[PDB]
Design a binder for this molecule. Sequence first.
Ligand SMILES: [Cl-]
Ligand SMILES: [Cl-]
Ligand SMILES: [Cl-]
Lengths: 469, 469, 468
Amino acid sequence: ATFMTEDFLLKNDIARTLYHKYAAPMPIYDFHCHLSPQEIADDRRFDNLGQIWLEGDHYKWRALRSAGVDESLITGKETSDYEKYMAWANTVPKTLGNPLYHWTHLELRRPFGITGTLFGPDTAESIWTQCNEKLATPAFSARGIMQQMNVRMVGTTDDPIDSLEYHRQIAADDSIDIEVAPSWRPDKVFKIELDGFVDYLRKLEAAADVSITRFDDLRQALTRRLDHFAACGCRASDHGIETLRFAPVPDDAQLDAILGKRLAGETLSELEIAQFTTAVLVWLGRQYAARGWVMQLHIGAIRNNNTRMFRLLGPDTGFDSIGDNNISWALSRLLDSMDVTNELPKTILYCLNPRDNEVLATMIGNFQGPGIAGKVQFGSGWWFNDQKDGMLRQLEQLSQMGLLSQFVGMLTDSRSFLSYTRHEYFRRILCNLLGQWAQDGEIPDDEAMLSRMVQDICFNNAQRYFTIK
Amino acid sequence: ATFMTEDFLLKNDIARTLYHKYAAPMPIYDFHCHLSPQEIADDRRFDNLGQIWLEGDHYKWRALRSAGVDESLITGKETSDYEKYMAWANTVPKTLGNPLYHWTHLELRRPFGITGTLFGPDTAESIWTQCNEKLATPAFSARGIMQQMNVRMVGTTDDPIDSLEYHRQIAADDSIDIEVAPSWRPDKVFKIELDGFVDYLRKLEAAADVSITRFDDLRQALTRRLDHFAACGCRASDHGIETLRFAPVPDDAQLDAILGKRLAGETLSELEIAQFTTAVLVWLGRQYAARGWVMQLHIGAIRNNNTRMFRLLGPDTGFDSIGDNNISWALSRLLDSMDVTNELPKTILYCLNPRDNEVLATMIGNFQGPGIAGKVQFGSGWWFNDQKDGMLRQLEQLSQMGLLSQFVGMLTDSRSFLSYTRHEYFRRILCNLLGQWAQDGEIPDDEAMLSRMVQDICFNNAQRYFTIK
Amino acid sequence: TFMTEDFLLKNDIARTLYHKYAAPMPIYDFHCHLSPQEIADDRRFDNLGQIWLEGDHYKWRALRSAGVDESLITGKETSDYEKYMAWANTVPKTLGNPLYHWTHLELRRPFGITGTLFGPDTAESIWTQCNEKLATPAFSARGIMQQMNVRMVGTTDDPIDSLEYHRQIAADDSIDIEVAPSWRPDKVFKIELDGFVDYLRKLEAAADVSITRFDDLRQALTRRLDHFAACGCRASDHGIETLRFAPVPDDAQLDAILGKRLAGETLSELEIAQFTTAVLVWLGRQYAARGWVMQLHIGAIRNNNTRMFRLLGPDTGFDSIGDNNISWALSRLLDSMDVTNELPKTILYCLNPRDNEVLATMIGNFQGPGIAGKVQFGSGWWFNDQKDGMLRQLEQLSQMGLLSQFVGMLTDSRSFLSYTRHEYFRRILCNLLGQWAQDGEIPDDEAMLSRMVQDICFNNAQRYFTIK
Ligand SMILES: [Cl-]
Ligand SMILES: [Cl-]
Ligand SMILES: [Cl-]
């Protein structure tokens, strides 16, 4: 009868208590996101609701396209923000069942305080005006929203060649107590088979002041950049792996020969690509272990599927989807290559194809370590899987194959300042899961035990895990 | 507790209202099936219940074999319809949990009007006699059943070499107002690696009255057959793909060489097979786009697994199952090859292996288009997946990754006139899903919005989607 | 309340099915890894830690995940009580993990401990109580088997084994539980493994046959199969991590391959597939001729941690779920035996649940007459042997096959405390059937439902494993 009350997704008494008493009030340790550091440093003020909300994480764009809306009303420079907004307002009523319908109303509730009203053509104009007035105030600036949402720390995703000037600016600014840490994402460095590898390498050379012609030079350059990240507060790395490969690491003469061919423009064989890629990832893994950083592996996307649209809009514009390569063998050999010398760092594994949930949940158990709780983690439902069904399936496998109690938990993985309600969504789902289990007599209804678990999964595990020990 | 009441599968009050008030009265647009056009044209009168029930869809055959029944009582020319029917009667009580138990009772209920009776040895005799008396009347002929089940349109699956004479006969016959459209299924044309390719190509030559030596001759022959299909009311195509391949389309000289080699009995390399198959599929896709037809891709079957039985019974006799090749890369390249020139048609994708559900639900989002609600669709649970669990999983991924509101819906994919209860089954499941979401406060409990959605998924979406723009 | 007698039973029909029909049925643990010598000598356990800690390596994996030092897990240096306390400190961290259910299920049966959560505050008392019980005859290896109403077990043995403890148990009137050996010839067909030559020499000595050509291997295996037959065997098992297939070549090629292996030469993928397929097809025909059940356990990725393998060896908790594509090879392998109508009774198991539907539909391609479900889709295996895993396997079997003919549950365990896994399964099954009945999805007919419960809990397996 009532849509999205304050007990949204809470279907039993234990769930309501867990959520309202132990989960909801915990701060957010958003260890992995795609927020713009300059927007945080400059404390961006948004002109209107379309501007802060529309692009989001390209889910709206995908929904608009699916609904048949012309691209001019989605990414077009020839239409106003208000027009793009009305197009979205006409589309939301068509999203029932899609998490977009939930996110939209969660986001209008927090931080905008709009409740008891469905977003659509008949309410859009009023919602636009009310939100625009709020957006004109300091509390609703980029920093303001982060503070209202109780954000304690965020980990941005950055490239080795970045200056991290905005991170330093934020660190040096006492008017903001939220920690904004950069994260090392060297994708371009290990994907030697991609067309832009050489161009990127030249940028790395200038960034590190190293002439890169031998593999060892690459190690030198990467060490310099790793040192820069360290100095700017980096505690984690990330790796977007679309094609997970593995080949035992050959000697430097062979790695030099591979780099040489690539620089000359010669086609590399799969073996050579696997060899180079594995050499870099293993060397990087050892560095992360030595520095006490968390290594994140985001595996399985298939990107830029639409050539016509890629030519007009470029990457990360809503044309990426789920890949389906076999991965257990390569994953196992890759992790083991680091662990054999006891140089496997704290590691978080994410799979974009949920058919791999059990592979990952069991894979982490092969490489755990002493003195730390859950050294190797199976990450929260990622991207397309960051929704109710997706999260329930991830949580179920982590629970059955590992230890839910030691789960680092949720992260927004978002470039939007309105994404913090994704933590609320996750928390409600987790509390309902635990509540249902307890109510059904599948776990004790000992509130002391459950409250501790909820607090840990919602924040304490993450904060502890990301500490450079 | 009572088995299969009129509220079967409807577990909440909202579900009951949606189903009984809005879903049940909707007509059926069975846009993809395997019904015999000749049986529709001649308005076949079945002699008995065994005949109309046991000539297919092969699910019964598989259940009978699993129960240890001799093949002679399943497909044998030697046993009578009544003896085969009794073997089935003795087996139904062993099928609890299998959708066969549901179909059997749904079908006796509609169209036969038999309720409150479990089918098995004790009741089979009476049921046989009662159904035989009804089968002898016009309301229970092939067309009669379709009329009783409120079928307004059907899309049969036909080969390019087919005359379509029965489709013409039905079109010209004013005593039948149900539209029976043919669907273009050119499997044999693109599966160049199969033994019967050359014999098939000769039949295509005969049907088109075109000599085929070069790849361009194949385009000419196919163009003529496409026009024949268009003139007989075709608005759709279908493609059964067991081995989804991809290789960039080479120039005609290469395609001619591949065809030349094949016609000479020479063995083709995997690259050559991929090139030819891809060239045919891409060209066909473009033709479908230019004509405004829907393109269906049914991917993943592993066929004729039992050689001993294949030699005695041939293909499509219940020895096919779920395959598991990796498909995202080939699928992406194949669709993008059509979409790059903006020549991708309305497309529906189906996967036989549910592990690929999320791959497909997300793949469709990469290629949507303007002016149509859900240009690319993720099809209803197919074949083995056309059951409660399978459909709930397919619906969940479509809901989460796409827009359920634009879903074209259910299709029987059957050769049996008693398959329309599969729509009843789908509708009850859908209504219960929406109802449960509404009741749990996950979607608004707004009868105007929900009923419109139910009606759209039950019929309106398909009617609009299959209309040539 | 946590784990009452109605644990996992959410409706009245389920309660009736479980308490009145499932629970009283005896157990036919047709596949396990129990030590026959422990059964023969009726092993007496010194303490709770001893009988419980190693189990099936699930506890070791949880301990490592919790950050517990390896010396307190597998170290020969620390005591049983220290290891036990480490485990007591870890159990409260396992909510949501089946370990929490097993722990408490095992304490209830056979130990009689109820209404208390296992943790640091209750561990010492539990240790003392359980130890007093372990000191009595009723809690010896055989005693526990009799307490859990175990009627038959199928051990997992290697072709070169003597099976002397099987012959001893059979000759002993004090024990009426049947303990049959099962033939697991993994080392024979996995030619690519380093230890293949050394193993072959053990087979040569066991069968007293000089193995130089492929036909010699047939003779050697035939003698061993006969030995196993004379010792009561009626089932086989095959652990297949890399499911291969290549058409079986003639003996000249098979001889050449075997020759290259014995001479230390490296084999190609085709060569390995040829040899492996020829051995599996030959064995399959043998199983068919003898009326034995053929089990295929597919999809493990083993010994993933080199550093730990070097210190502890295999089966120490460092194996996980593989993910190779298997439908094509599985189909051609089964078809290679079925083409001459020589496919035996077969149970298929997949370690990766994404393959549930592949297996559930694959079995339907090779069913046979005069038998109820010749080819079976096995219960959730290993990692999948838990509530979610079992429910998913049951659902696919039900949707694509015939649940009524399911051979049912097996522990696949080396622990005498594993019989509660049967209890767990039975509760889950009864609740599933009960929920369907209550929702009007199946008839609420006690006669039909009870029959089905008893068949799945014991009758189906007893008939299925009968050689006839
Ligand atoms: Cl978005
Ligand atoms: Cl059928
Ligand atoms: Cl264990």
